[PDB]
């Protein structure tokens, strides 16, 4: 049902988290087609905060439609004059979400007071790992399957922080096959 | 020099400009191998926001080295050490990126109250437009020249706005020329 990148996102807020910096929530965005995730920390549930990340994002690519939660962000009046000026339809549902949420939730829990530091380390990671229902990463469905990729060590990611592999091997093994 | 995207980032700030939704500054940075350009609405030039900015950034990847102005925000000792954490070099010292920031400046503002509910829009007509130096728009360099479009029209750019379509001519008529 989404046609092409940047087509169709999956929109939904996790959290609350501890508090690292002052951030308590993570706006995570899919895209329908490649499955390429952004994740967005924020400290408030909120349409401003929303409207700020959604904000970076289409400056990419202005999406046709958009999926979320019955959450109070998403919900709001400030929210669909947003999307009608931006031409954006918007969609509402309360599946492979919930399995990709929750561990993201753990893995985040898991590092209290740093999990902001390795929010793009996580980012990078979950977009850069084989999807057996894909048949490749969604990365290499984003940027193009033979185009060369920013890591030398594909392998590693070029991680070398020892608490940031320790990310990698645990994304890895359980993402799709729990 | 530039082997891949994500190799080397050119940083600057542009402001202060008139303030719209809050923010005076906006914090540009363009990718060395393709001149993709991300740029972000900020509140000051300070540190701080650069990191915010490049958090997003650098989640899609690491960039091996950051080129910048020896501006306070690129300087400071922390914006060092949070450099240093993650492997990257800082290369403090070019004609064409400044051109490119009088070019930016003088667009946004010219709509003082508008600019940031447009910044969107200046972004997608900059990385959407074909440059003459690169043979494809910077779009097409970092997600493939076979990368599939975003959007429906080359000439509108799914854009029916006012602003936006005077902005679109604006930028198409004056980037590389």
Do not use: A, W
């Given at each position: 049902?989404?046609?092409?990148p940047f087509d169709k996102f999956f929109m939904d807020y996790i959290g609350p988290l501890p508090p690292?910096?002052?951030y308590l929530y993570v706006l995570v965005v899919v895209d329908g087609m490649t499955g390429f995730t952004w994740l967005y920390p924020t400290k408030a549930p909120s349409t401003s905060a929303t409207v700020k990340s959604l904000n970076v994002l289409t400056s990419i690519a202005i999406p046709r439609v958009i999926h979320s939660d019955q959450g109070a962000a998403f919900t709001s009046s400030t929210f669909a004059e947003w999307a009608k000026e931006r031409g954006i339809?918007?969609?509402?549902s309360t599946?492979?979400?919930?399995?990709?949420k929750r561990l993201l939730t753990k893995l985040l829990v898991g590092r209290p007071t740093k999990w902001y530091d390795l929010l793009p380390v996580?980012?990078?990671a979950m977009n850069n790992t084989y999807s057996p229902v894909l048949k490749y990463t969604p990365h290499q469905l984003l940027f193009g399957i033979d185009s060369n990729t920013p890591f030398a060590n594909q392998d590693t990611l070029d991680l070398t922080r020892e608490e940031e592999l320790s990310l990698?091997?645990?994304?890895?093994?359980?993402?799709y096959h729990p």
């Open positions: 049902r989404p046609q092409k690292s910096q002052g339809h918007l969609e509402f599946r492979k979400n919930s399995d990709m996580v980012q990078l990698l091997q645990e994304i890895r093994t359980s993402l």
